């Protein structure tokens, strides 16, 4: 969270495992895996996507891809409203950083790119 | 240095007047020489607010029957005080077979004999009586009703097949004993409207106590 | 400051203000030599006992106060409400955590208390001659809770000035933003009906009214997070 | 909070946030059994290795970002620039300390990173058919540094979203105002030309834009202070 | 003869005929060092693992045979079906107990077998030129199971005469009335979709047709009772 120091409030960050559909509302999202983030208390918070696996093979059009289906979803909800005092901006930004954990791996080299050396 | 007078037993001791049964000769009131008084500790005005300082209470009661005519005169009349415990059928007539059912303890006494006196145990099937019950018994008219607080009923009557020669009055006094209470709560500060609920007059909501002109003038 | 987790629920909170243990008693279970020892009362652990964070209420200058009924507040909510409905008997304790988010330029003070057997009363038609009775929406308001109409008498003819006689805690914006209360199972029976009897009420009322200057966020969020402790259910249906 | 001194230079700074040691390596010297052991490389200590505080940059809502080239940034500046020019070969490490001064009512976040061999690219005439080449003012900007024209691609066709793969640190106004990075000498040769080759670039870009309300100082000062570590020079001229 | 209980379910059965443990392996769990060790797979015990007795089938002289698909057969049924649907991954074993009730004057013999990956085939329009595909009602028939149309080829082009190559047991009315088979989790992956993939089929086919004389109850009841063993679920929804 990169808002003002004087700004406070709570956000509910939720992970819906694969198959599960985006929660209708905050209420139901709360019933699942989630984190109540108080950007008044801590400026950063980290969510862990327990597991993703791009292994299920597909053969759609005529081009055979190896796609996910393991699309877990991360939904962010306003738990409270954004609270600020006089003189503090009414809009703040959140920066999201991501990376794979140590148990991450990759198989089958596949050179592919749209960015190739020019003529 | 002592603190006995502020113990719950002390606070709730004493025998208060909880009931008054009228047995007139000519009259609209109790025309059948008998009367059924369901036990109500609230009979003593002052009691309701006091017991309601707590949520749950447990106790015994000693009942004393002081009978005489409306002039306080003493007459040669035999009486029957029958205690029909909760769950038992009360008499519906001066000739109900209930008056004869052995399981309804009865005391027979003369108006000339000193007051009758008996002890009634904690009757509730629950661990304690409770003045407040936020729920319904399995918008509604059943809200707040804890039935498991019935202590029983006292059926009063002159003895005999024929009406009594005298006009009578039986005053029922109750002394709470072996008192225990739990979960204290704010003391009622608005007048009561109904025996069964906390409803208060929303138009006449008065301040808890007295007021003054300004906060700086005593 | 540190964030705690129970199951899949994680709340961010401050190290540890002072918790209040209602009547000095921790919520405990009910042992084998009880009335129903034939129908062993299953004690939910997994998901049932975790952090439920309810819809935040907005505190305004005009706000009179709010209250929630337990266990009613969760009987609709998720897997606890699951058990609360399809089980004949229930008993349980609760960790209640009421939190605010306000700037150092906001001001006010909330009184947070727990009142067992919080029976609501009606105005009785104003003149007090009408023996009206509170609606089901007022008696058992769900997770949205309900707003007091006459706080001074706690919508029940009793002085809120004396509400402190009950397990309570103050949330004075200039000194703290959260209150925590532990409630043990309080009733005249070991087990009771989860849907018919509300063992207690959660009251949060402004005693020193919300205030701030023009330009500051005008509504302050009161967020109730609560977790069941030592809950038991009996007789599945 | 405490103020440190190296020679005649004294900066006031906070006890010790987290320093970042680029690639886990501390700047060290180069031992005797090297290519030039005949022309003993003098290792400046006295004044050469001390605190150089450059002209403060003003962060604005519109600011796209700034970058400086090392050792170019000091080759003009004082007694280090003295050695940097009249010496044939050079190698050196650096302590870089980027600090902000803003109120608790300002907001924003800068990404501070070090990118070895930060080769700049041109827009190539827009259509990309012009093989234009960056100016000397852009390639080696001096102590005033230079402003990015297209931060998203770091003025070089690469994603700034991935700049964190380089030694870096964040300056999020609501949590910190300074970042510190230690850079070891990084090159494919032990010694190289101080004026022709810029071993690395210092990038400081706003990712979460500066913001504040009307009436608050509209420009926030980014002050770069830097000190050479284990610098060596060879072949005097 | 003696009656056993698991939870609230109690079946009356004979001491212990010969049970068949499919492939000599008992259904076991899946240990911590697995693909999903982050999302700990809850292993239902309480009610989930108990006796489910399905609608009895009536064996007739004309009966061709029945089959059920697992785990499909219970995905609709109660608290197991509860988990089977709202959980992303599943693995489990099964105790299957097929029982008959017939007089010493009835006669016949059923072959009870378990066939992993029991893919059903269609008649292909009779001439075999139609690439028709089995319906969902045929592929995953629920707790009522489904009746074979062409037992000789197990509705899939394979000889039922060779079905004994699979975990099986015979129910020959003149010698026994019940068969019991233990099936371990059999699949090319440790966990899989409970609703999309049916790990195996339960086949019960009359090889020696039902027979009795006029006046004897004309339909004999085949009652399938089954209990999950070492079931695991992952990823709640």
Automatic annotation (TrEMBL), chains C, D, E:
Localization in the cell: Host cytoplasmic vesicle membrane; Host nucleus; Virion
Protein name stated in the entry: Genome polyprotein
Organism encoding this protein: Human enterovirus 71 (EV71)
Functional description taken from the UniProt entry: Capsid protein VP0: Component of immature procapsids, which is cleaved into capsid proteins VP4 and VP2 after maturation. Allows the capsid to remain inactive before the maturation step.
Entire-sequence positions represented here: 82 to 318 of 2193
Binding partners and assembly: Capsid protein VP1: Interacts with capsid protein VP0, and capsid protein VP3 to form heterotrimeric protomers. Five protomers subsequently associate to form pentamers which serve as building blocks for the capsid. Interacts with capsid protein VP2, capsid protein VP3 and capsid protein VP4 following cleavage of capsid protein VP0.
Family, as annotated: Belongs to the picornaviruses polyprotein family.
């Amino acid at each position: 969270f990169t808002g003002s120091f004087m700004a406070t409030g709570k956000m509910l960050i939720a992970y819906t495992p694969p198959g599960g559909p985006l929660p209708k509302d905050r209420a139901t999202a709360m019933l699942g895996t989630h984190v109540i983030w108080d950007f008044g208390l801590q400026s950063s918070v980290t969510l862990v996507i327990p597991w993703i696996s791009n292994t299920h093979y597909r053969a759609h059009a005529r081009d055979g891809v190896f796609d996910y289906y393991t699309t877990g979803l991360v939904s962010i909800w306003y738990q409270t409203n954004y609270v600020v005092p006089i003189g503090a901006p009414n809009t703040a930004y959140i920066i999201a950083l991501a990376a794979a954990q140590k148990n991450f791996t990759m198989k089958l080299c596949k050179d592919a790119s749209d960015i190739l050396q020019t003529g | 240095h002592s603190t006995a007078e502020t113990t719950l037993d002390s606070f709730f001791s004493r025998a208060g007047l909880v009931g008054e049964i009228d047995l007139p000769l000519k009259g609209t009131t109790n025309p059948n020489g008998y009367a059924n008084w369901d036990i109500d500790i609230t009979g003593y005005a002052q009691m309701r607010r006091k017991v309601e300082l707590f949520t749950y209470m447990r106790f015994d009661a000693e009942f004393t029957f002081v009978a005489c005519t409306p002039t306080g005169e003493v007459v040669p009349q035999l009486l029957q005080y029958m205690f029909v415990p909760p769950g038992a059928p009360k008499p519906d007539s001066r000739e109900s077979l209930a008056w004869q059912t052995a399981t309804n303890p009865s005391v027979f006494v003369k108006l000339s004999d000193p007051p009758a006196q008996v002890s009634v145990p904690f009757m509730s099937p629950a661990s304690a009586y409770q003045w407040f019950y936020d729920g319904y018994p399995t918008k509604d008219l059943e809200y707040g009703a804890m039935p498991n607080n019935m202590m029983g009923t006292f059926s009063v009557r002159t003895v005999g097949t024929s009406k009594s020669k005298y006009p009578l009055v039986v005053r029922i006094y109750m002394r709470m004993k072996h008192v225990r209470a739990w979960i204290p709560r704010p003391m009622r500060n608005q007048n009561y409207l109904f025996k069964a609920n906390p409803n208060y007059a929303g138009n006449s909501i008065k301040p808890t106590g007295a007021s003054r002109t300004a906060i700086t003038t005593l | 400051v540190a964030q705690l987790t129970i199951g899949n629920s994680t709340i961010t909170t401050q190290e540890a203000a002072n918790i209040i243990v209602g009547y000095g008693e921790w919520p405990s279970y009910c042992s084998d030599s009880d009335a129903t020892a034939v129908d062993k009362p299953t004690r939910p652990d997994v998901s049932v006992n975790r952090f439920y964070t309810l819809d935040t209420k907005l505190w305004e200058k005009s706000s009179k106060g709010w209250y929630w009924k337990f266990p009613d507040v969760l009987t609709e909510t998720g897997v606890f409400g699951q058990n609360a409905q399809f089980h004949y008997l229930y008993r349980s304790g609760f960790c209640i955590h009421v939190q605010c988010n306000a700037s150092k330029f906001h001001q006010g003070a909330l009184l947070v208390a727990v009142l067992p057997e919080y029976v609501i009363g009606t105005v009785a038609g104003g003149t007090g001659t009408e023996d009206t009775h509170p609606p089901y929406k007022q008696t058992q308001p769900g997770a949205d809770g309900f707003e007091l109409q006459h706080p001074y008498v706690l919508d029940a003819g009793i002085p809120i000035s004396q509400l402190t006689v009950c397990p309570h805690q103050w949330i004075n914006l200039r000194t703290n933003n959260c209150a925590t209360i532990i409630v043990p199972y309080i009733n005249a029976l070991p087990f009771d009906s989860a849907l018919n009897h509300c063992n207690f009420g959660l009251l949060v009322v402004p005693i020193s009214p919300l205030d701030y200057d023009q330009g500051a966020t005008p509504v302050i969020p009161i967020t109730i997070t609560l977790a069941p402790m030592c809950s038991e259910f009996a007789g599945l249906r």
